[PDB]
Design a protein around this ligand. Structure first.
Ligand SMILES: *[C@@H]1O[C@H](CO)[C@@H](O)[C@H](O)[C@H]1NC(C)=O
Ligand SMILES: *[C@@H]1O[C@H](CO)[C@@H](O)[C@H](O)[C@H]1NC(C)=O
Length: 218
């Protein structure tokens, strides 16, 4: 299970992962549908040096099959997250090698929006919505009070999370609503949020700017 990690919008470089055989006739690249059905996308003849791309609109003007059978896909999309197979064909044999492609799109810097004009003591109020957009894969939202993680607590800290996918791009938008019961200790205290996600270089976290609220009490 060899994997190629690519950032959204970059060129995906997929080497064949096969030794060049003696008596090579041609090579072909294909991708597998979710249930394993094959779709051929590129062809290269070793004898004629010709290059042909199958009529697959999803890959129109996006492929380049080099002389050593490396397939390059331009402008990485979420639909490119598939298993690709390099097939080398000789006069009496077929050799196949798969490569898993994973695509990553960095979530937007989170922002606290739809903010309360003021928080009320002994009353649960919607502090705001922490939104992080156009991400792939989805991310986890954490809330903080004075730079310290704010965990849920019955009748005091209620966190309502949702992840929505755009059906055309397959990118995620994460929204975390914080319903909060303030105290006078929150006078001039900053509230922030962050998004934790997996990218090509591993697990990363991006923090938001702070939000300070006027605390009202009877
Ligand atoms: C040879 O393969 C490498 C990847 O292993 C690729 O970067 C290079 O462009 C290829 N060269 C040719 C001439 O196909
Ligand atoms: C998000 O949280 C879940 C647990 O709820 C965890 O399994 C997952 O690895 C977390 N994702 C990231 C990007 O850390």
């Amino acid at each position: 299970w060899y994997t190629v990690n690519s950032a959204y919008g970059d060129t995906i470089i997929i080497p064949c992962r096969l030794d060049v055989p003696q008596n090579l006739m041609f090579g072909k690249w294909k991708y597998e549908k979710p249930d394993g059905s094959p779709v051929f996308i590129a062809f290269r003849s070793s004898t004629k040096k010709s290059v042909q791309y199958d009529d697959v609109p999803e890959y129109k003007d996006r492929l380049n099959l080099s002389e050593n059978y490396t397939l390059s896909i331009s402008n990485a999309r979420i639909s490119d997250e598939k298993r690709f197979v390099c097939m080398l064909v000789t006069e009496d044999n077929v050799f196949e090698a798969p490569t898993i492609v994973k695509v990553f799109k960095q979530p937007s810097k989170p922002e606290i929006v739809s903010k309360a004009l003021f928080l009320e003591t002994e009353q649960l109020k919607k502090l705001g919505d922490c939104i992080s957009e156009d991400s792939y894969p989805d991310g986890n939202i954490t809330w903080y009070r004075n730079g310290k993680v704010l965990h849920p607590l019955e009748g005091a800290v209620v966190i309502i999370f949702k992840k929505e996918m755009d059906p055309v791009t397959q990118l995620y938008t994460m929204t975390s609503t914080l319903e909060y019961k303030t105290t006078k200790a929150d006078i001039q205290m900053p509230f922030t949020c962050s998004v934790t996600y997996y990218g090509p270089s591993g697990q990363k976290t991006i923090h938001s700017e702070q939000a300070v609220f006027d605390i009202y009490y009877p």
